[PDB]
């Protein structure tokens, strides 16, 4: 995405920081959270095995 010359930050619908302009080379970037989730265990019953 392209920005304005005085533009520095970027947001989304949920007002969250998404993109930042490089302070040393006026380049653009993106920021996204990385992997996370839950874990589940499948068992057939402690009696059988």
């Amino acid at each position: 995405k392209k920005f304005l010359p005085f533009q520095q930050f970027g947001r989304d619908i949920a007002d969250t920081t998404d993109a930042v302009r490089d302070p040393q080379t006026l380049e653009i970037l993106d920021i996204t959270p990385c992997s996370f989730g839950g874990v589940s265990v499948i068992t057939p019953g402690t009696n059988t095995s």
């Binding site: 996204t32 959270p33 996370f36 989730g37 839950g38």
Partner: protein, 197 residues
């Protein structure tokens, strides 16, 4: 977008293709086997003879249907065509289903937007409290944010529990409707359509 905070969706157990196979199975059974397959093994029967029994149970003699078979056939086909075109009218027929989706979006959006409220502290970022305050004077401010976000969470969950009751009430009605209107003939008035069934 960007999966926001710790929110997930989880997938349904039965895929849309699998649901379409049950509906196809029911349509095939009623055309060929009549209502016999609703209780016991299926037994074949010609379709015009099957429609004769329906006339008998409504109070009309079998004589009428056979003598006007050509006229009845054309009326049925004409009625079907009007249904397809009428669903392309103003999106009011599908209003009931679209209301469910809209309500969930409002409930979930409000929960996320609640994360940017001071609740009586200096700011609304956890790191800023830690970065600009000493440990002994930070537990007082943090305890204000924690109690604020619990009320927001419990409010959302309580609303969902009530709303799930209405859906279950509607689901039970559909199950009864299928067991009577499509797998048989009903003498209840105004239950399956407007008029004789």
């Amino acid at each position: 977008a960007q999966k926001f905070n710790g929110l997930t969706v989880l997938p349904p157990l039965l895929t849309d293709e699998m649901i379409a196979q049950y509906t196809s199975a029911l349509l095939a059974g009623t055309i060929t086997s009549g209502w016999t397959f609703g209780a016991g093994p299926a037994l074949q029967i010609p379709f015009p003879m099957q429609m004769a029994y329906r006339f008998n149970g409504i109070g009309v003699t079998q004589n009428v249907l056979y003598e006007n078979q050509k006229l009845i056939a054309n009326q049925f086909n004409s009625a079907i065509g009007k249904i397809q075109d009428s669903l392309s009218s103003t999106p009011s027929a599908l209003g009931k289903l679209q209301d469910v989706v809209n309500q969930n979006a409002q409930a979930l959006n409000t929960l996320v937007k609640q994360l940017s409220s001071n609740f009586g502290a200096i700011s609304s970022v956890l790191n800023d409290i830690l970065s600009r305050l000493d440990p002994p004077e930070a537990e007082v401010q943090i305890d204000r944010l924690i109690t604020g976000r619990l009320q927001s969470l419990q409010t959302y969950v309580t609303q969902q529990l009530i709303r799930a009751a209405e859906i279950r009430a509607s689901a039970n009605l559909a199950a009864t409707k299928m067991s009577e209107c499509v797998l048989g003939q009903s003498k209840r008035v105004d239950f399956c359509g407007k008029g004789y069934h």
